[PDB]
Symmetry: C2
């Protein structure tokens, strides 16, 4: 595992040198390495130190970040975390003079952006007033949040200077935007009241944050695009091409008056207009479409009672019953589900998805999991309160001796649609070298 990570780091060093058109001799000269030695660092015979990575960021126009791999802590492609481990991670935090939350980690991975916490509400309120002084608010946090409610939990949320309180119960859920302040209390001291607060990051975190942080606040603010504003998207692509209204009109076959009008409205153009504009701009129609959001006051609440329900693979012989939980079209790759596992057999493999997956066993019976990864088959059993992390691409099935429920949150990773289409365009054999460069570029 450490040797595999070292190999990944060595491949990144060769890739960086190849990309800078530095062959072995040129890289040794730039990095102050002994003549003839570069192959020993690229092959793994010599370790790549933080000293060398720091020297490379000074000698070359790259960052220390560009030479570091990430860790693989999910070697079987799925990993379970046990209740005992979650309880050992316990943190109690006081707010307003008394204990307010108990936090427990659930299944996480260095390969994924999940930060999923079990959190019990320790503050009990006697009304649903958002301005109740017993409520201790947070400041909001960068990560998106999907929250699943168990018991009589009150959800408090703030946006544009107004505080709201929506009472929840078991099976309700909410999806929420970055930096939206919120809080949770219990309406009763008599029954369990807790949440699965499954926060996660996506594209905002990682490379985008590092880059935008160097540009500064003004440049970053100026790159923002408001959801649903198609005219702004069109203006942005026009600016990226350095085209003009009359030139785009001439190339697309649209009237100049129409192109100007489309630049000034959030409503999308008609489909034939979008196709003509896209071709004139050298982009797919995909790039002129802007997602809408369903959020209001920066959250989208899904009542469990009215949530969509369906059976898999179908009602004639159902293995699972799914309930659709809260999400948002700003994050089309986030799927949240309550899963009733009905089958006692391993006869219903779920289709592999490009998403990361997180599982948490809500029901009273254990769930047996069977999965495949890199030519091996594995099996395991999640007890109630156990959780699991699954990398993209894994085929697994679930079963239980009696019907039982689990919570499933699936999120997009860094392999976005654009990445996946780039992978699809690569010539045969190239994906291997993309994963781990193994040679000088000539």
């Amino acid at each position: 595992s450490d040797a595999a990570r070292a190999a990944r780091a060595a491949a990144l060093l060769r890739a960086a040198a190849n990309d800078l058109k530095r062959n072995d001799r040129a890289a040794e000269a730039d990095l102050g390495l002994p003549p003839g030695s570069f192959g020993d660092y690229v092959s793994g015979r010599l370790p790549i130190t933080w000293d060398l990575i720091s020297r490379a960021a000074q000698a070359w126009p790259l960052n220390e970040r560009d030479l570091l791999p990430i860790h693989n802590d999910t070697p079987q492609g799925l990993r379970m975390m046990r209740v005992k481990e979650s309880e050992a991670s316990s943190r109690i935090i006081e707010r307003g003079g008394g204990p307010y939350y108990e936090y427990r980690d659930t299944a996480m991975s260095r390969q994924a952006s999940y930060r999923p916490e079990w959190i019990s509400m320790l503050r009990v309120v006697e009304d649903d007033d958002p301005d109740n002084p017993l409520v201790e608010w947070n400041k909001g946090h960068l990560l998106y949040q999907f929250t699943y409610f168990v018991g009589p939990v009150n959800y408090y949320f703030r946006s544009g200077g107004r505080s709201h309180c929506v009472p929840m119960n078991t099976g309700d859920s909410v999806w929420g935007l970055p930096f939206a302040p919120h809080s949770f209390t219990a309406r009763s001291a008599d029954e369990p009241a807790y949440i699965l607060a499954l926060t996660y990051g996506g594209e905002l975190t990682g490379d985008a944050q590092r880059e935008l942080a160097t540009f500064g606040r003004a440049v970053t603010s100026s790159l923002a695009l408001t959801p649903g504003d198609h005219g702004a998207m069109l203006r942005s692509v026009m600016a990226a091409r350095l085209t003009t209204v009359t030139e785009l009109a001439d190339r697309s076959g649209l009237k100049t008056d129409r192109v100007a009008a489309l630049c000034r409205t959030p409503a999308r153009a008609e489909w034939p207009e979008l196709s003509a504009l896209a071709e004139a701009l050298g982009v797919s129609v995909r790039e002129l479409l802007v997602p809408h959001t369903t959020t209001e006051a920066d959250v989208r609440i899904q009542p469990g009672r009215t949530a969509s329900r369906w059976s898999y693979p179908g009602p004639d012989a159902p293995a699972y019953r799914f309930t659709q939980l809260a999400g948002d079209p700003l994050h089309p790759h986030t799927t949240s589900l309550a899963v009733d596992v009905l089958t006692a057999r391993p006869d219903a493999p779920l289709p592999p998805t490009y998403q990361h997956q997180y599982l948490y066993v809500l029901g009273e019976q254990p769930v047996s999991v069977r999965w495949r990864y890199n030519g091996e088959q594995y099996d395991g059993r999640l007890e109630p309160g156990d959780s699991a992390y699954v990398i993209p691409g894994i085929e697994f099935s679930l079963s239980a001796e009696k019907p039982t429920e689990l919570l499933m949150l699936r999120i997009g990773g860094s392999a976005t649609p654009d990445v996946r289409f780039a992978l699809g365009a690569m010539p045969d054999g190239a994906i291997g070298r993309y994963i781990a460069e193994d040679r000088l570029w000539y």
Copy 2:
């Protein structure tokens, strides 16, 4: 600025602790630190060391990479590189027992993915045969290639086991896919023959490579999507939502047989069908559409003589004359242009774009550049053969005392459209915190 970068690293440390719901004392417990030291690290009283970052990656489900900022090496928003500096970076490479290429760096930044080399063709051929033994091929490299030709350069390229040669002349260009093998030679020893080989990264480099490398080649290949393949895109979203053909038909109003058939073809559904399917899947129609490509043999060649040209900002105000160079809809955010600078005054500012920009002066007269960044106005001059790098969001003008030509390559950075939608959805005032977290989460 090392001090600013150290502050960025401190902020990432606070953010990582916030995301894991570790306050100061909890973080000190997890990391084995003495009491009070975690505040010292976040505040800057103690420097953040590789030892601390390594400890964090061992104790917490994060990567060392996640705690490192990138460098700001473009403090004025635009940075020029001079002929003398490019010449100083000269590297001569032999292939087949004699000189083949001279490489020279041009403007680059730790904030962008450009790897732009000036490259002189040192191998002279007497025919255009791709199997000529004087032609020495590379193995293909990870980065995308955008190449502008000067002089009688032969371009050689391989795809699918076949080798090709297209004789180029000044003003021709080509855009090429990752790992497509290629070469360049000169048809004459008696005139300059060289290229601007403006390689760059996109979606593939950085986070996505790091994650995919830990999943392995089998999973990574399974995630590929073929450009143009709408049925694969539909199947992907269906698998992400765990909707069968029958359930998606049920929701959308399309017949079961029609949904199944749309999953078996690259051709897109009809627009009303796409609208109904997207609504049923909780996504914008954008997520059922796919990029297409125009590449043949993995490249897209643009003859200079047939390239589209237009005046900017308009026909009746031609400050500049643009020539559209080689690109592809697989990279909608890549704009390649040859720019004839016609105005002698800085009276035609180019609108700010979300793209990074790279400039190289091709013509025989200097180009004056006036730009603004962070409330300050700057003036500079690019001599023939000088280059420049520009961060996103900069407004600049170009002027010259006589018409002169500049090569421009604009590429998308890590702030993808999805990042920009997310920035637009963020509550007002939170971009400061996104750039640099400055507080405990509660």
